[PDB]
Curated annotation (Swiss-Prot):
Span covered, complete protein: 57 to 141 of 501
Subunit record text: Part of the inner core of the multimeric pyruvate dehydrogenase complex that is composed of about 48 DLAT and 12 PDHX molecules. This core binds multiple copies of pyruvate dehydrogenase (subunits PDH1A and PDHB, E1), dihydrolipoamide acetyltransferase (DLAT, E2) and lipoamide dehydrogenase (DLD, E3). Interacts with SIRT4. Interacts with DLD.
Domain of life the protein comes from: Eukaryota
UniProt disease annotation: Pyruvate dehydrogenase E3-binding protein deficiency: A metabolic disorder characterized by decreased activity of the pyruvate dehydrogenase complex without observable reduction in the activities of enzymes E1, E2, or E3. Clinical features include hypotonia and psychomotor retardation.
Domain Lipoyl-binding: 8-83
Functional summary from the UniProt entry: Required for anchoring dihydrolipoamide dehydrogenase (E3) to the dihydrolipoamide transacetylase (E2) core of the pyruvate dehydrogenase complexes of eukaryotes. This specific binding is essential for a functional PDH complex.
Modifications after synthesis and translation: Delipoylated at Lys-48 by SIRT4, delipoylation decreases the PHD complex activity.
Organism (species): Homo sapiens (Human)
Record-given protein name: Pyruvate dehydrogenase protein X component, mitochondrial
The family this protein is said to belong to: Belongs to the 2-oxoacid dehydrogenase family.
Length: 98
C-alpha cells in the first residue's frame, strides 16, 4: 500500500544530565489538543527529581505512543507525535492533501 506522512516525532529528551530512562507520570495534554513550545506536555520521572517535559515546538498532539503510567522510558523513544495545527490529526483525506 501507500501512506506517506510528515509529522514531528517526540523522543524522550535528556531532561537529566545522566539519565538512562524516564517515567511519564501523567500527560498534561490530550490527543488532539494544541501544543506550544515551553508549555508542559507531561511529567517525566527521574531519579534526580520530578521533571516535566516541555514542548520544543508548537503543534497539535497527533497521538500518544507512550501513555502515562509507563515506567523506564529510555531515551530516543517515541512517546507521541505532533501535527501542524489544522492538519487532520485524526485522519486526513480528500481531494487535496493525500
Amino acid at each position: 500500500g501507500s501512506s506517506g506522512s510528515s509529522g514531528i516525532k517526540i523522543l524522550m529528551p535528556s531532561l537529566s544530565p545522566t539519565m538512562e530512562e524516564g517515567n511519564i507520570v501523567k500527560w498534561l495534554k490530550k490527543e488532539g489538543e494544541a501544543v506550544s513550545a515551553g508549555d508542559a506536555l507531561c511529567e517525566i520521572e527521574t531519579d534526580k527529581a520530578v521533571v516535566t517535559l516541555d514542548a520544543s515546538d508548537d503543534g497539535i498532539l497527533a497521538k500518544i505512543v507512550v501513555e502515562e503510567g509507563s515506567k523506564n522510558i529510555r531515551l530516543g523513544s517515541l512517546i507521541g507525535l505532533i501535527v501542524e495545527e489544522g492538519e487532520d490529526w485524526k485522519h486526513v483525506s480528500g481531494p487535496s492533501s493525500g
